[PDB]
Design a protein around this ligand. Structure first.
Ligand SMILES: CC(C)(O)C(=O)N[C@@H]1CC[C@@]2(S(=O)(=O)c3ccc(F)cc3)c3ccc(C(F)(C(F)(F)F)C(F)(F)F)cc3CC[C@@H]12
Length: 253
């Protein structure tokens, strides 16, 4: 349906929604790159109990997912969908959007990430006992950072991660299909206009994001078996809803 200028307003409106629902400002993230944790502070984290590290990380993932819900709310056409599809889209997209957004807090020169006020490497999360998933998270961020995303690019790409008509459970599939197409056009027009079409082939493939989510849910089903009471008492209720309601409350707000 959409025309040009109408499709150009969408680019501006999708970048605004993303700028707003940013957990950390990109400018403040590049400012703290020099604040690397000491070998002692690193050792502190490595010596934490597995369940205390897991609940510290679960709380951080929940906080990040809560910004993605807010982003989805301000996303043009998203709140114009039915509530079933809104939950379908978030319950698949939210984690993958977080996995994309996290590249802004990864420094590729020292292979570190901003965590709890300072930058630290893979070794910081050793207490989690899922080195393979940590490796995959850092390697994904490494490849995404190599694209040298702009704030507009990272905004349109994440809205496309979120709006996928190939999600099982969509009641109004054709409505989502129309929005996914308008957002695809908007993304391609910005890449065209800014002479950045090159990144399309360089972008991550279909199952790269999908494999991280499966690795995460496999590794949680493993922890949750060893410490089921830790999950019930010390894990956030939104984390448990998405990976083991809250979404209805956050949506109508
Ligand atoms: C911008 C900002 C704040 O950095 C951000 O968006 N963070 C994201 C939200 C929290 C965070 S992190 O920093 O704590 C993190 C953890 C391990 C890493 F290797 C790298 C980062 C996180 C926390 C737990 C997990 C688990 F799957 C994992 F098992 F991997 F730890 C969990 F715990 F959920 F299972 C994965 C991730 C990856 C995405 C980032």
């Amino acid at each position: 349906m959409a025309s040009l200028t109408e499709i150009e307003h969408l680019v501006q409106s999708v970048c605004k929604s993303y700028r707003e629902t940013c957990q950390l400002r990109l400018e403040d993230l590049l400012r703290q790159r020099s604040n690397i944790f000491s070998r002692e502070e690193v050792t502190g984290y490595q010596r934490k109990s597995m369940w205390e590290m897991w609940e510290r990380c679960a709380h951080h993932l929940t906080e990040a997912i809560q910004y993605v819900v807010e982003f989805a709310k301000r996303l043009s056409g998203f709140m114009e969908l039915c509530q079933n599809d809104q939950i379908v889209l978030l319950k698949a997209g939210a984690m993958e959007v977080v996995l994309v957004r996290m590249c802004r807090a990864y420094n590729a020169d020292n292979r570190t990430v901003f965590f709890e006020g300072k930058y630290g490497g893979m070794e910081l999360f050793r207490a989690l006992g899922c080195s393979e998933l940590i490796s995959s998270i850092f390697d994904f961020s490494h490849s995404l950072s190599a694209l040298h995303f702009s704030e507009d690019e990272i905004a349109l790409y994440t809205a496309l991660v979120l709006i996928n008509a190939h999600r099982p459970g969509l009641q109004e599939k054709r409505k989502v299909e129309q929005l996914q197409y308008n957002l695809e056009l908007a993304f391609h027009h910005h890449l065209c206009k800014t002479h950045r079409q090159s990144i399309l082939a360089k972008l991550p493939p279909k199952g790269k994001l999908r494999s991280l989510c499966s690795q995460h849910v496999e590794r949680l089903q493993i922890f949750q078996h060893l410490h089921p009471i830790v999950v019930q008492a010390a894990f956030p209720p939104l984390y448990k809803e998405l990976f083991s309601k809250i979404l209805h409350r956050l949506l109508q707000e």
